[PDB]
Amino acid sequence: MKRKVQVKNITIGEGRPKICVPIIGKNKKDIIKEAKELKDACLDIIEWRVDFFENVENIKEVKEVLYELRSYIHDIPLLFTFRSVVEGGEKLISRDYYTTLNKEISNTGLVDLIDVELFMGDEVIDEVVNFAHKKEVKVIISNHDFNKTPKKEEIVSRLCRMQELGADLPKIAVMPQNEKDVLVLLEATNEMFKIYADRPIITMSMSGMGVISRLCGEIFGSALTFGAAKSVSAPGQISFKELNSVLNLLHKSI
Amino acid sequence: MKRKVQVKNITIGEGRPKICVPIIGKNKKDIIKEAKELKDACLDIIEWRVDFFENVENIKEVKEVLYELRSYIHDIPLLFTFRSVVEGGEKLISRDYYTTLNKEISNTGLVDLIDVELFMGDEVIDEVVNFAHKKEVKVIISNHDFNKTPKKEEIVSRLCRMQELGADLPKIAVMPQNEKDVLVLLEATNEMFKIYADRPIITMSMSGMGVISRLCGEIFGSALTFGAAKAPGQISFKELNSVLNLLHKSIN
Ligand SMILES: *Cc1oc(C(=O)O)cc(=O)c1O
Numbered sequence A: 001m002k003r004k005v006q007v008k009n010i011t012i013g014e015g016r017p018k019i020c021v022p023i024i025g026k027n028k029k030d031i032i033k034e035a036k037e038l039k040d041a042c043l044d045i046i047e048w049r050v051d052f053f054e055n056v057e058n059i060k061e062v063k064e065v066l067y068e069l070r071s072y073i074h075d076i077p078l079l080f081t082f083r084s085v086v087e088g089g090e091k092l093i094s095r096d097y098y099t100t101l102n103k104e105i106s107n108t109g110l111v112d113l114i115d116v117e118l119f120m121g122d123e124v125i126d127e128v129v130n131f132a133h134k135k136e137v138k139v140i141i142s143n144h145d146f147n148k149t150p151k152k153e154e155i156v157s158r159l160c161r162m163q164e165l166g167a168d169l170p171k172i173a174v175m176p177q178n179e180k181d182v183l184v185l186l187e188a189t190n191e192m193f194k195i196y197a198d199r200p201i202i203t204m205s206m207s208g209m210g211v212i213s214r215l216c217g218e219i220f221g222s223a224l225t226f227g228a229a230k231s232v233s234a235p236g237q238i239s240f241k242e243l244n245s246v247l248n249l250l251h252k253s254i
Numbered sequence B: 001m002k003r004k005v006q007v008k009n010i011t012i013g014e015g016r017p018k019i020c021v022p023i024i025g026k027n028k029k030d031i032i033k034e035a036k037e038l039k040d041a042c043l044d045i046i047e048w049r050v051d052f053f054e055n056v057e058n059i060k061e062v063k064e065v066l067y068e069l070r071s072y073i074h075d076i077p078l079l080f081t082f083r084s085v086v087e088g089g090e091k092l093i094s095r096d097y098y099t100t101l102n103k104e105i106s107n108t109g110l111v112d113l114i115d116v117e118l119f120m121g122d123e124v125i126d127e128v129v130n131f132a133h134k135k136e137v138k139v140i141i142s143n144h145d146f147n148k149t150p151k152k153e154e155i156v157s158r159l160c161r162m163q164e165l166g167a168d169l170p171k172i173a174v175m176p177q178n179e180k181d182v183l184v185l186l187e188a189t190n191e192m193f194k195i196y197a198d199r200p201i202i203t204m205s206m207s208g209m210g211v212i213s214r215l216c217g218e219i220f221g222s223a224l225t226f227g228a229a230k231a232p233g234q235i236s237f238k239e240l241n242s243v244l245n246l247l248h249k250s251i252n
């Protein structure tokens, strides 16, 4: 069977996919303003994309925001994510600081999950994952491809590697070059879900063409889907309110 | 550059998929009541599933419903469909009457489209298609598999055959036995759409597992999607419409 991943009072891997919405504010004021817009909406998890925070290199200022943020969102599960430049992020930092940041923040007891990138390598991952687990923090190990959709077996191989590395929630995001690529991502998702996964997984096909992948998790297997805070697309994004409506519509269809 | 299909003021094959809702009333009063709920609603096309009509074997009573129905939906495109028993319908009728019914209703000038089944055979199809076209009525040629999802290539072969038989709108509905079957239906749809189609097509994967196929037609290539008026595997048409516009705006 499979393990479920409990964060706060939310059970990832059970029922309807959970909706996660990111906070991308550049400063403390904007982050809190974003948080207040999300604290009482129908969403499941809030992600703090800390790589947008201008003072991310100062651990003390990062902690200060985290304290305040925690106080406003109460018991909503919080995912901490520093997305590196190579995988779409906003700020260059060292490998050593990436490790320190994630460890120090996991140590606060204020974050429920952290996102660590597969591409950082086994040394970094082993250190950050083991420490997060010591602090009862759940781990998403993520990988992105912004130019293509790897073959089904490649996608499955990466998700399996993420399980082997101790990810509580393997995550993969790929870019379709055509409509068939969106279907490959969905095919890989379900094969993993059905045959290889012993825990919940997170997958998406990016761009406008890949949006179906954000809607059909309950059927194909993605356990978490990401909505945008605002009601304006990138495009390829869906505002979280509208995403909630679609997920409920599909949950009730069966 | 690909042909669109124009019915009244609705352009099928352009922009978001068009929403079609069936009326399944067993009698005239019930059919009218249903039409009254759909007339000022957010949908594009109304389908009359005439096989549910108890007096379907009386062409004069079928026409009577049609004249009354048109006083309520004068400008909404109307699709006329007698779904046969072999393809999930309610009423057994002869092959001759199936042909007669579709011809006399096409001749009234009061329906914008009719739906005839591919597996009725070329003789029946050729006669009905030819006559419908002389009256400027659009024809959906449909095919259903309630037990399984044929292989991608067989789905494409059927959609191609429908085009060869003069369908204005090829239509296929298949039943998934697993999640991959839903992807097979979507893959066949886009393959047909991009490589072999010279007109709009309509496709769907049935049941709760295939519901996603009713929502993503703009990306994959289905030009019409069917909502329910009031059942697992069906989506109320009211919701269907917000979703389609939401997805139309999210395109690159
Ligand atoms: C988590 C996650 O989500 C998206 C998205 O577009 O919603 C993209 C992405 O790269 C990522 O890591």
Ligand SMILES: *Cc1oc(C(=O)O)cc(=O)c1O
Residues within 6 Å of the ligand: B088, B142, B144, B173, B206, B226, B227, B233
């Ligand atoms: C047109 C059409 O729609 C459905 C549906 O489930 O909406 C099924 C079906 O057999 C058909 O012909």
